[PDB]
Structures are given as structure tokens and as C-alpha cells.
């Protein structure tokens, strides 16, 4: 099958910048590469077809180019309404249509240092049997922030799951909530629970830790 690699995975740019997105195909497609736009939640909207055709009713600032495997979508001047997710789809294989990975365009700003908060499981939840430790990173940019869980100085991987909100409309900062979920028996088996955060805006990793049953 044909796989479409769309780069960059996510770029940061300001309004008026000349944005460029690349799309590569595993095999050769003559001119059958199309570009679609999709806002968060809203439905996709066609932008470019045949890789060199502007869809009717679309701003002229969008321009597609390239042939074969490598294709490029260029916006001469970015606009506030242009921050969305762009997909590239190859049409050469008509009955095996595939879409690109996507390149979300975020609003460029200054680096924001995350605020780290650690919440232990509630006694009400412990009554049920489960225990969840909540690590909240608030008001940081860019979204690339490594969150690690430590139990008795032992790394934990796969025991939790993260959730990142969209870029904020006010300060364009991100929020992440990591929920380390486990059973009651595994909760009393260990004492120290810590959340380490590494972010571009942090000179060194920041660790928020607590001992079980000490307040």
C-alpha cells in the first residue's frame, strides 16, 4: 500500500509567516496529491486538488506544488483563521485512498514554564478499591513536556495515561493531566509517589512528590 509521510508533525508559526508543509509518498504519483484543511472538531474542507489547483472559494494565499513523491503546500501569509490541521491525500491509487499524517499549525509564542500539581487518590476512590494519582501541568508552551512517574524511586511506564488540551485561546498555553491508576493493594505496597516534568521552559526537571498517608 501507499504511505504518505507529512512533515513537520507540528509547527509553530505566527500570523503572516510563510508556512510550508511537505508530503512524501512511498511510491510515485504523477500529480494526484490533494490538500485538505480541518479545524478541531469541524469537518474537513478541501483546499487543493491535483497538487496544483486551488479549490474554488479558497483564499489565493494557499499554493500547492511538487510532482512525483514530494509535494509542498505553501501559505505566503498566515492568517488567524489558518491555524488548523492540514492533511495530504494521494489519489493515484483510486481504490486504496490514503491520507497523510497531518501537520497541526499552532500559534507561536514565548516559552511558558509549566505549573506542576500532584493530587493523591481521594479517600472516596480508595473506598471503591482503585487509586488514581493526578499530575497536572498547566500553562506551558510548547506542548512538548515529558511527564514521568516514580514510585519508590522506580520508573513507571504504561501505568498511566495523559490528556492534553488544545492550545489556549487566551494565552495559547497547554494543559496536561496524567492519571496514574492502580489497585488498592499496589497503592499501599509503595510509599513515595512522584511526578517529574521536563519542559523546554525548565532549566532542570521539576519533581513533585508525596508520601502516602502523610498529608
Amino acid at each position: 500500500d501507499i504511505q504518505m509521510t507529512q512533515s513537520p508533525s507540528s509547527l509553530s508559526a505566527s500570523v503572516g509567516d510563510r508556512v510550508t508543509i511537505t508530503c512524501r509518498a512511498s511510491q510515485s504519483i504523477s500529480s494526484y496529491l490533494n490538500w485538505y484543511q480541518q479545524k478541531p472538531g469541524k469537518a474537513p474542507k478541501l483546499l487543493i486538488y491535483a497538487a496544483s489547483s486551488l479549490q474554488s472559494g479558497v483564499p489565493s494565499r494557499f499554493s500547492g506544488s511538487g510532482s512525483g513523491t514530494d509535494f509542498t503546500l505553501t501559505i505566503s501569509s498566515l492568517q488567524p483563521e489558518d491555524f488548523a490541521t492540514y492533511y495530504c491525500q494521494q489519489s493515484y491509487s483510486t481504490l486504496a485512498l490514503t491520507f497523510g499524517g497531518g501537520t497541526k499549525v499552532e500559534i507561536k509564542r514565548t516559552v511558558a514554564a509549566p505549573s506542576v500539581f500532584i493530587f493523591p487518590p481521594s479517600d472516596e476512590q480508595l473506598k471503591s478499591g482503585t487509586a488514581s494519582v493526578v499530575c497536572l501541568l498547566n500553562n506551558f508552551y510548547p506542548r512538548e513536556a515529558k511527564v514521568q512517574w516514580k514510585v519508590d524511586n522506580a520508573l513507571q511506564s504504561g501505568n498511566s495515561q495523559e490528556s492534553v488540551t488544545e492550545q489556549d485561546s487566551k494565552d495559547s498555553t497547554y494543559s496536561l493531566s496524567s492519571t496514574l491508576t492502580l489497585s488498592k493493594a499496589d497503592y499501599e505496597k509503595h510509599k513515595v509517589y512522584a511526578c517529574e516534568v521536563t519542559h523546554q521552559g525548565l532549566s532542570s526537571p521539576v519533581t513533585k512528590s508525596f508520601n502516602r498517608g502523610e498529608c
Binding site: 485538505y36 469537518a43 474537513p44 491525500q89 489519489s91 500539581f117 493526578v134 497536572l136 490528556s163 494543559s175
Partner: protein
């Protein structure tokens, strides 16, 4: 001016059957090939099916070939998508799109709002609301709406009075098959002892309304 309205989506158990209907308006439905495209929650686009203008040719993606069916009634200007033997992978929002036919190949001109279809083997359950108290430069508290199904659940603070500083994170489908959601709000550390913070959670599918008080931890 072209309109496509999707209907028939809902919650169904695995292995069951469902019938989605797309209503076309403000263009010649019978003179264009229709496309069905599904997007899973949080995933990208996935071409599913195509039907010819005359309803004589039907094509499906390999993921659903021999499992779904696409038909169309030109008299009623309707497009029917029968999904038999549904699996959990089918949980997604489906959209009907017009071809356009300006090229020798398939391109997508217009997209409808789509309809959601959820495939799960769990019955409707009432949400469990738990507090998340703050401690001692502002403070942040919240509520946890855990073990609920299906989506969505509406969460408000102080019966909607508390608006600024409230963040409701998207629900996560935990391994148990239910949904877990967390709502938080940041308030000054000064007004934290006497102020009453109550989160109101309503789950219409389960018809469950719960008002949970949030107060600082005492130790």
C-alpha cells in the same frame, strides 16, 4: 449551496447491525457518486465506501469489504449505509461527501456534519462523582466524573455561576469500557474556607444528576 444531513447513528453492541441515512439537498443527487468516510475519535480520515451516481457500482475499503453495504434511492435523494456485523473499530463519525467528478480520479468537494456511531459491549451506567480538594499563590480544586457510559456528560460549577478559570478535559475511554472525565477550576487561596464549591454533573443518557460539594482537605 449544497446540504448533506446524516442520521441514524447511535450506540450498538458488537456484532449487531445499523442503518445510517444521508439526505442530500440543493444539487442533483442522482448525477454524482457519493462517498462514505469515517473518522474515529481522535484519529484521522479513512475512506470507507463509494457508490456510483446510478447506484449500480458499489465499492468498499478492505477494512469493511464484505461487512458493510452502500445503496442509494435517487427518487428520495437518499444514501443508505448498512453496517452489519459491527465491531469496536467501527466506533467513529461517518460523513457523506459528494464526488464532483471534475477529474478522472476521486476527490472530495463537500463534507457533511456527519453522525456518530459507537460500538461497545457495556450498558449505560450512572456517573460516579468524586471531589478533588485543594491544599495550602492561588489554589485549584475539581471533580472527577468516573465510571460513566455513554458520552457525553455535562459538567458545571456553582450551577453555571462559576465560569472563568474552569477547564473540562476531554473524556478518556478507560480499559473498563467506561469513560473517565476530570473538571478543574482555579480560585484564589484566600476564598477557600467558607466558599461553597459544588460541581453539577448531568448524564442524560443515564439520566443521572449529581451535585458534589468540594471542600479543602482537613488533616
Amino acid at each position: 449551496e449544497v446540504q448533506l444531513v446524516e442520521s441514524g447513528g447511535g450506540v450498538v453492541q458488537p456484532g449487531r447491525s445499523l442503518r445510517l441515512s444521508c439526505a442530500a439537498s440543493a444539487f442533483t443527487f442522482s448525477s454524482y457518486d457519493m462517498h462514505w468516510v469515517r473518522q474515529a475519535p481522535g484519529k484521522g480520515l479513512e475512506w470507507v465506501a463509494v457508490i456510483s451516481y446510478d447506484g449500480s457500482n458499489k465499492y468498499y475499503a478492505d477494512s469493511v469489504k464484505g461487512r458493510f453495504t452502500i445503496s442509494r434511492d435517487n427518487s428520495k435523494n437518499t444514501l443508505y449505509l448498512q453496517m452489519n456485523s459491527l465491531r469496536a473499530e467501527d466506533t467513529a463519525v461517518y460523513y457523506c461527501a459528494k464526488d464532483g467528478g471534475k477529474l478522472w480520479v476521486y476527490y472530495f468537494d463537500y463534507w457533511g456534519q456527519g453522525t456518530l456511531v459507537t460500538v461497545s459491549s457495556a450498558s449505560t451506567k450512572g456517573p460516579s462523582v468524586f471531589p478533588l480538594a485543594p491544599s495550602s499563590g492561588t489554589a485549584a480544586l475539581g471533580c472527577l466524573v468516573k465510571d460513566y457510559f455513554p458520552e457525553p456528560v455535562t459538567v458545571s460549577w456553582n450551577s453555571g455561576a462559576l465560569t472563568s478559570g474552569v477547564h473540562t478535559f476531554p473524556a478518556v475511554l478507560q480499559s473498563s469500557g467506561l469513560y473517565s472525565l476530570s473538571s478543574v477550576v482555579t480560585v484564589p487561596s484566600s476564598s477557600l474556607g467558607t466558599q461553597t464549591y459544588i460541581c453539577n454533573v448531568n448524564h442524560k443518557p443515564s439520566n443521572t444528576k449529581v451535585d458534589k460539594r468540594v471542600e479543602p482537605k482537613s488533616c
